[PDB]
Amino acid sequence: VVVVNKQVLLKHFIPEGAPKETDMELVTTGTIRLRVPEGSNAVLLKNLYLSCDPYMRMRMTKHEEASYVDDFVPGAPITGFGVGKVVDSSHPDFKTGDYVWGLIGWEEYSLITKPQGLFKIHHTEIPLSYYTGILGMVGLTAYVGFYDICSPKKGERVFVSAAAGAVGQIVGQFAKQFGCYVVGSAGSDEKVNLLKTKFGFDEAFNYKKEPDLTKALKRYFPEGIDIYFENVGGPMLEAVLHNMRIKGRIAACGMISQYNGVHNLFLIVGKRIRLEGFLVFDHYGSYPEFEEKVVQLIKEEKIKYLEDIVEGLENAPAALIGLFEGRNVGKQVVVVSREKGHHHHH
């Protein structure tokens, strides 16, 4: 049994600046046998869904010394988080018909030879695509960032940049449900309005239509900010610092403003601010409890979640690109292949 296997490859490395669709290429002639090798310690996956995540951009650029994650290889498939089904296994922990999530290939089928970086999916009542984000890497990020790095108290005043992004939207809800005052910022009036209507943010604003970020935060935060969940960085951070309260905390998840400086750092001393970067890579020990908490929320309908869904691998390169441009409304997902039988969608 030998089948077609479409692939998406890094065409070439790219310099400083912005990725483009043409940095990738779809190849359709390749094939793959539908068993694992004898004597292997591997899992063969039919790839169902793929996440486009902002961090992927970094991996298109060549690094002499190892950044946290290895660079993509020219002529080799793009990889990143996704969800898959075991077509075959020669590793004990995974059986034919199991569903998993983790780093897989941007292709129809992945022979994973490092199976220990996969996680079996225990709730199949939930749409599998959620394990690309809310129940995946993205949710875990929100969860660790917020509960751990921000040390929040019932009553504190929370600001979240890229609030309409996948992490941001989950942070915002965790925080409102913690008894916090929550304000997010975004790139669209469409998204500002989702933050308030769908996601239950107390206020929200479009950063692009604000000529003074510092005064912008002032209107929303008359007594200052306690907790900045930071996805953006740059002049946004300057403005947050200006507006931060005694003993404020900044969780430095990302600085997306910087992928494709700050002048008032000294305010950290006299306001006794804690600024701390964190990486969800270091925190997989918290997954299982994180999983049960967020599963309960969904079943209970105490959390809302929006996915931006694209259909088919060949659509993956533009979706990834749109992500960088803020074209995604909700967590960007690509459907490589839907598993058979069932939700409904509009």
Contacting residues toward ligand CIY, per CB under 6 A: 53-55, 58, 254, 269-270, 279-281
Which CB, 13 or 281, lies closer to ligand CIY? 281
CB of 167 to ligand NAP, least distance (A): 3
Between the CA of residue 249 and those of 152, 226, 228, what are the distances in Å? 9, 6, 6
If contact means CB under 5 to 8 A according to the sort of partner, which of ligand CIY, its own copies, ligand NAP, none does residue 110 touch?
none
Beta-carbon contacts of residue 333 (< 8 Å; ≥ 6 apart): 49, 50, 51, 52, 129, 132, 133, 307, 308, 309, 310
CB of 144 to ligand NAP, least distance (A): 8
Which residues pair with residue 79 across a beta bridge?
A: 105
Between the CA of residue 72 and those of 9, 59, 78, 182, 322, what are the distances in Å? 9, 5, 7, 37, 19
In this structure, is the dihedral angle defined by the CA atoms of residues 250, 256, 259 and 263, taken in order, positive or negative? Answer: negative
Q: What are phi and psi of 78, to 5 degrees?
A: -55, 140
If contact means CB under 5 to 8 A according to the sort of partner, which of ligand CIY, its own copies, ligand NAP, none does residue 309 touch?
none
d(CA 26, CA 9): 7
Q: Which stretch binds its own copies (CB under 8 A): 122-130, 195-203, 254-262, 316-324?
A: 254-262
d(CA 149, CA 143): 9
Q: Which stretch binds ligand NAP (CB under 6 A): 91-99, 209-217, 252-260, 298-306?
A: 252-260
Greatest Cα pair distance, the chain, in angstroms, is 68
CB of 273 to its own copies, least distance (A): 5
- Ranges within 204-233 binding its own copies (CB under 8 A): 233
The answer to whether 79 touches 105, Cβ cutoff 8 Å, is yes
Which CB, 46 or 284, lies closer to ligand NAP? 284
If contact means CB under 5 to 8 A according to the sort of partner, which of ligand CIY, ligand NAP, its own copies, none does residue 268 touch?
its own copies
User: Kindly report the CA angle at 167 between 172 and 113, in degrees rounded to 5?
Assistant: 150
* Count of residues engaged in binding its own copies, rule: CB under 8 A: 29
> Does 238 help bind ligand NAP (rule: CB under 6 A)?
no
Between the CA of residue 287 and those of 37, 75, 112, what are the distances in Å? 31, 34, 21
String of contacts with its own copies for each residue 12-51, x by CB under 8 A? ----------------------------------------
> Does 305 help bind ligand NAP (rule: CB under 6 A)?
no
Q: Interface residues with its own copies (CB under 8 A)?
A: 67-68, 233, 237, 252-255, 258, 261-279, 282
Q: Interface residues with ligand NAP (CB under 6 A)?
A: 53-55, 137-138, 141, 162, 164-168, 186-188, 191, 231-232, 253-254, 256-257, 269, 278-280, 323-324, 326, 328, 331-332
